[PDB]
Structure 1
Amino acid sequence: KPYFLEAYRPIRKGDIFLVRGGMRAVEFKVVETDPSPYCIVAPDTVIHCEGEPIKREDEEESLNEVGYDDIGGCRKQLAQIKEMVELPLRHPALFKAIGVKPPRGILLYGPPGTGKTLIARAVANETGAFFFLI
């Protein structure tokens, strides 16, 4: 109710709109909309208190995963990495269309607790590339 209030948030059936409170981030999927396809939420809509844990479908990647929005203070090097390794993953057929040598090894050095593995996992999640840890 606080979230929908003063908002008139548009919403389509199946959306995963997320709410935050009680220092926890819970996302509620709208399963059914009486009109279709989408609807505005109005304060005059009776509200429906069910609270059942329907398990998430396998195919979607949970919102639990990290992204570029979960890191701060390393914008310059983050942009460097993004521009360095954006083409070989989103455009490999290109790299087979041209004769050029891409990088095949990267080193990151800094004091511990600076967000290195976090950066690697964020980059992996944000391009769909398979991630392996050693």
Structure 2
Amino acid sequence: NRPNRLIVDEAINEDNSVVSLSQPKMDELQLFRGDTVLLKGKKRREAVCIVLSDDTCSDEKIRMNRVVRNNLRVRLGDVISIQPCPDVKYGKRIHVLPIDDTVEGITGNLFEVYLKPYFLEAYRPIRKGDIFLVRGGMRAVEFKVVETDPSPYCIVAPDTVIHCEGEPIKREDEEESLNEVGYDDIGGCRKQLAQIKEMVELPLRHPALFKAIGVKPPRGILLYGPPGTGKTLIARAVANETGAFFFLI
């Protein structure tokens, strides 16, 4: 029923928004390697991205990047609604504005350092109200388009002009700070992260189901190891990747 629902979990490609599917999926959804796809999430918001051909990922799973995970307001293990978009898009004007929480201490023409060698030779699609992360200059800033042609009808093209404004917009509470620690900020602990996920996220993400079943949830997880191994980092990441209230003692 409804062969359009995808399970959301973290991707492995260390790049910008690029979704990865399994071998039967691009043939079942009649989309090729270099195709434009549309992501639809909760709270009546959309996302547009480019698929990637993968085989040794899983039987039925999409791969979801953290850059646009907050764009759809969806966390780990969520269900997403995909849709192929065989619509030709080209950008003419895209009024883009950074956020004055991560761009402080940076001056000059930020385009030629951050946006210019990030757009060309990529051909990425941009939707209305997209928060995409750009790394460079020994720091990372997220960026926000605020005004363009009707959504999305936009891909990265050399024929797209841009203009700076010099007044970055503030960050509202509707979105989560990408500067916070996530699952992608932990390296070298994937088995431990897998165990923590299996023991933590299912009861937290589905509290009503776990209350209905009446089965014992593991509530005494104890991390241990040598100092500086990321125990606090892992705990904060698990807190952030789930919609659970976090109290620190």
Q: Any conservation in 2 of the 1:13–1:38 contact (CA below 8 Å)?
A: no
- Provide structure 2 residue ranges, at least 5 long, that are not aligned to the other structure: 1-115
1:12-48 deviation digits (Å, cap 9, x = unpaired): 1100112111111111100111343331122122221
TM-score by length of 1: 0.92
Structure 1 residue matching 2:126: 3-state secondary structure: strand
Counterpart position of 1:56: 171
Structure 2 residue matching 1:123: 3-state secondary structure: helix
Offset at residue 68 of structure 1 (A): 0.9
Offset at residue 53 of structure 1 (A): 2.0
Structure 2 Cα separation of the partners of residues 17 and 87 of structure 1? 29
Return 76-85 or 51-60, whichever deviates more. Answer: 51-60
C-alpha spacing 1:115/1:45, structure 2 compared with 1 (3 Å): same
Q: Any conservation in 2 of the 1:12–1:39 contact (CA below 8 Å)?
A: yes
Structure 2 Cα separation of the partners of residues 99 and 57 of structure 1? 39
Q: Any conservation in 2 of the 1:66–1:125 contact (CA below 8 Å)?
A: yes
Structure 2 Cα separation of the partners of residues 54 and 118 of structure 1? 29
Structure 2 residue matching 1:30: 3-state secondary structure: strand
Q: Any conservation in 2 of the 1:13–1:31 contact (CA below 8 Å)?
A: yes
Structure 1 residue matching 2:118: 3-state secondary structure: coil
Counterpart position of 2:236: 121
Return 4-13 or 50-59, whichever deviates more. Answer: 50-59
Offset at residue 109 of structure 1 (A): 1.6
- Provide structure 1 residue ranges, at least 5 long, that are not aligned to the other structure: none
1:91 aligns with 2:211: no
1:35-79 deviation digits (Å, cap 9, x = unpaired): 433311221222212232211112211111111110011111110
Higher fraction of strand? 2
Q: Any conservation in 1 of the 2:126–2:152 contact (CA below 8 Å)?
A: no
Structure 1 residue matching 2:169: 3-state secondary structure: coil
Structure 2 residue matching 1:86: 3-state secondary structure: helix
Structure 2 Cα separation of the partners of residues 124 and 9 of structure 1? 31
Identity value in percent: 100
Counterpart position of 1:31: 146
1:105-125 deviation digits (Å, cap 9, x = unpaired): 121121111100110000010
Equivalences, count: 134
Q: Any conservation in 2 of the 1:8–1:40 contact (CA below 8 Å)?
A: yes
Structure 2 residue matching 1:25: 3-state secondary structure: strand
- Which runs of 4 or more aligned residues in structure 1 lie more than 2 Å from their structure 2 counterparts after TM superposition? 34-38
Structure 1 Cα separation of the partners of residues 212 and 123 of structure 2? 49
RMSD of aligned Cα (Å): 1.3
